[PDB]
Amino acid sequence: MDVHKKCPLCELMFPPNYDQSKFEEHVESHWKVCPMCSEQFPPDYDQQVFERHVQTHFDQNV
Ligand SMILES: [Cl-]
Ligand SMILES: [Zn+2]
Ligand SMILES: [Zn+2]
């Protein structure tokens, strides 16, 4: 019966003909983003681990 595109990260759903690219754009909008290098992560990626990534850009001296 699945007549819609399910977002995998939230509860939303879309017309089955919903602009693929716009849908990719939706999905991307949940991702966490490193403010220095822009790497992206699952929204639920561990916050400690995530912060450690950011910090490393500094600790390292880029
Ligand atoms: Cl740590
Ligand atoms: Zn979503
Ligand atoms: Zn980064």
From Swiss-Prot:
Instruction: Point out which parts of the chain are UBZ1-type zinc fingers, as ranges.
Output: 4-30, 31-57
Q: What is the effect of changing Q55A?
A: Reduced affinity for ubiquitin
Tissue spec. comment = Expressed in all tissues tested.
Please report the PTM annotation for this entry.
Phosphorylated in the C-terminal region by CHUK/IKKA leading to NF-kappa-B signaling down-regulation.
Q: What domain of life does the UniProt record list for this protein's source? A: Eukaryota
> Where is this chain's protein located in or outside the cell?
Cytoplasm; Mitochondrion; Preautophagosomal structure; Cytoplasmic vesicle, Autophagosome
Q: Which residues bind Zn(2+) 1?
A: C7, C10, H26, H30
Provide the residue positions that the database annotates as binding Zn(2+) 2: C34, C37, H53, H57
What the entry says about domains is: The C-terminal UBZ-type zinc fingers function as ubiquitin-binding domains.
Q: What does this protein do?
A: Ubiquitin-binding adapter that participates in inflammatory, antiviral and innate immune processes as well as selective autophagy regulation. Plays a key role in the negative regulation of NF-kappa-B and IRF3 signalings by acting as an adapter for the ubiquitin-editing enzyme A20/TNFAIP3 to bind and inactivate its substrates. Disrupts the interactions between the E3 ubiquitin ligase TRAF3 and TBK1/IKBKE to attenuate 'Lys63'-linked polyubiquitination of TBK1 and thereby IFN-beta production.
The subunit structure is:
Homooligomer. Interacts with TNFAIP3. Interacts with STARD13. Interacts with MYO6. Interacts with TOM1; the interaction is indirect and is mediated by MYO6, which acts as a bridge between TOM1 and TAX1BP1. Interacts with MAVS; this interaction induces MAVS polyubiquitination. Interacts with TNIP1. Interacts with TRAF6; this interaction mediates deubiquitination of TRAF6 and inhibition of NF-kappa-B activation. Interacts with RIPK1; this interaction negatively regulates RIPK1 ubiquitination. Interacts with NBR1. Interacts with TBK1. Interacts with RB1CC1. Interacts with SQSTM1.
Write the protein's name: Tax1-binding protein 1
Q: Which organism is it from?
A: Homo sapiens
Q: Which gene encodes it?
A: TAX1BP1
Q: Which residues of the full protein are shown?
A: 725 to 785 of 789
